[PDB]
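can u pls check wat happens w/ EU9
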Amino acid sequence: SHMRNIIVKKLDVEPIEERPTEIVERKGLGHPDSICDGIAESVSRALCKMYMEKFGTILHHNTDQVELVGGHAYPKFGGGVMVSPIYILLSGRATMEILDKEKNEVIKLPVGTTAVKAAKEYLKKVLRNVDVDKDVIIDCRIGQGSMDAVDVFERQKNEVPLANDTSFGVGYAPLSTTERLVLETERFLNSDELKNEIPAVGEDIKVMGLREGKKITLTIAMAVVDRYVKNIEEYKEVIEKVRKKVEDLAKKIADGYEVEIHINTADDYERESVYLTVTGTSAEMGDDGSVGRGNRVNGLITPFRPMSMEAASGKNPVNHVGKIYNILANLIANDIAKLEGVKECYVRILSQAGKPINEPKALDIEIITEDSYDIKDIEPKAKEIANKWLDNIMEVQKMIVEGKVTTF
Amino acid sequence: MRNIIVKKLDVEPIEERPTEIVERKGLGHPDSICDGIAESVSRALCKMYMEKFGTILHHNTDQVELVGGHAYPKFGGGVMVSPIYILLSGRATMEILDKEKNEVIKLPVGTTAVKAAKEYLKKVLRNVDVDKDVIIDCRIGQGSMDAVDVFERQKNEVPLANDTSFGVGYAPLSTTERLVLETERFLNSDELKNEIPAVGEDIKVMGLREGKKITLTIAMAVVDRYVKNIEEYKEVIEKVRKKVEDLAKKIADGYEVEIHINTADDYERESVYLTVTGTSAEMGDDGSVGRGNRVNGLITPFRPMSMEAASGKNPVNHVGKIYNILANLIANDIAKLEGVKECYVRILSQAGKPINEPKALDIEIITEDSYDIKDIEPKAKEIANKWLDNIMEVQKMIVEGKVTTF
Ligand SMILES: Nc1ncnc2c1ncn2[C@@H]1O[C@H](C[S@+](CC[C@@H](N)C(=O)O)Cc2ccccc2[N+](=O)[O-])[C@@H](O)[C@H]1O
Ligand SMILES: [Mg+2]
Ligand SMILES: [Mg+2]
Ligand SMILES: [Mg+2]
């Protein structure tokens, strides 16, 4: 019998697929910006587990600040040279020392060492051809703050946090054909299965999707690992092999559309200027990266959908409402899109300062209905879903800490 | 035959929608400091390359990390405790090979970059001591050969796109958008700060519209050397509040405008938004590039946005910058057309293609009532073509500092 500020409105516009144009981009796992996002969030999760193990609660921190400076390299067919390591700077802030006045004690937490280790372990996980011992420098200037033990005691209650702000989050569902194709192309090209078959395929993968009516053009940037290509001929063969597999994929999930595929379009075979790398990422020299300049929490960049500019990765999963709302809005929209009669769904969430985060100032649900469905038949089910997720706001926090949801 | 596409868009105009959220991070905000420094470095390197070779060489310094410092604010004047650390980064042509001498010649990228960053900081932070309050480090590195090759391939003709990217633009600005934009610009204008030197440059403005009610929330750093006490601080807030009220009446006529300033203040305990330098960077707050305003100067989740960070990217062939400026220019001109209520422009590149040959130049138009898109389409198409014909004027506008990147 709990009452919230939930709004359901019928959205009387053309669905996304019926609109004539779509542009969708995804920065893959080995992309420098995605590397930074992933490190930012991995450090946060590591600190969360650090806090949980000591206190059984999560303390204030934000590590949504990571800078990747491109290294120096000399690619060469058969195996190139890494000259200067990739330099990564961890930044942000985290609670480090707890001042207890009652007890005459100070507890200090391994903030910096935890951070550096988390970053290193994430890099080891995603970058097959980077030797993290020699190819990377992980520096750390994360601020180390203090906190009164009494405030720790309060946090240990693990009550729903209050919104300390008027913040916004937006999400939508379902993914369009173009969105789905862009997303799964990158996922496939960075899957273990493909790597094993075509080890020359690096992790620095970018996928741009343009839809014109019922024609989808995929433009793929793909770093080739030079130890696996003996010459320009073998380089070409890798491109064609990848093209074939992407064609097959397009048939599987974009059947009915005309699909056109372009790979490494900056290449000039004549001048022998191609996307050749030593490590499989342009972070080795070609490009730099930092946090919040890539994918939204749904894993896409979508100028035909509403987007939040806030950088989710690295933000406090406890009390940063913007991060929580953008993830929550996505989770809610996804379930509402599963409902019978829902063609398209947009969810916007706005916080009420001074109020619990799961008691928003407004939660707006916009639904494009399928033909012959009444929005008023759907609305009850929709509000129930939204209220269910809001009741379980603390479960959303857990999902983030356990990495069961994406932040990029 | 350019790939220009024009569509009628049948949705509710933004002004008529019930809710609107708009944000602007002012010049002194840590993220905007980074954007500003990034662009200053690029402009400086452009000038240096031009002086030495009569041409611009490959670079992209769209990477600046600001690690917050620490300070001790105090009425009448406080002091810095730990310097703000800023890391200049990105790609740049660091050296050239003298093929005849068979020797490497180093270019002054590092010195040019560090000087440019310091000069910019001096400009936007009146009360910062760059010798004591800030550390500017530099790790800009050589770009890859493939990057340089694409840059040089047709630099003398029509440059080839540095990347596969899209830019976005739209027009006109809504009442809320213009209010947020002009509030910050006004409060960070030299004329106002000369009148009220207590006003720091770190000004964050957020506009929330609900119907015809606009709530303006302002977070404004106050410079503690210009406020003797909590009372003088209070007088600053109310002076600024009066100014913004007057401004709102001029450009938001017919709307109910609420103005909330530094809402986290606690006068009872004298815990207020006091700073030594006029920026929250001194408070341990961090910044980086492309975390804030788009090229139109706003953050707009109810408008289409590009995630590209224009600041610091080279103005020759990086479409991540050029197409975002170009899209804004085209949208503005189309918005001038009678029968056009709203216009959205999206411009997509393909890496290696001439920058005047976008893979798609996408135009959406909300028409005024009783106007035919068929009458508007040819005009919109001509504006787009006109601009692609003059695409080199974009570079020229950027280099001459005639447009903003944030
Ligand atoms: N040779 C390449 N061809 C295609 N894509 C690339 C190449 N190198 C890197 N990328 C991918 O593009 C991303 C941004 S890169 C950003 C450019 C900028 N950092 C620069 O300094 O040149 C693009 C790029 C870099 C070097 C050569 C060619 C390109 N390019 O035309 O695309 C980068 O993060 C990679 O994922
Ligand atoms: Mg980038
Ligand atoms: Mg920020
Ligand atoms: Mg980009």
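The first strand of chain B starts at residue 4 and ends at 8.
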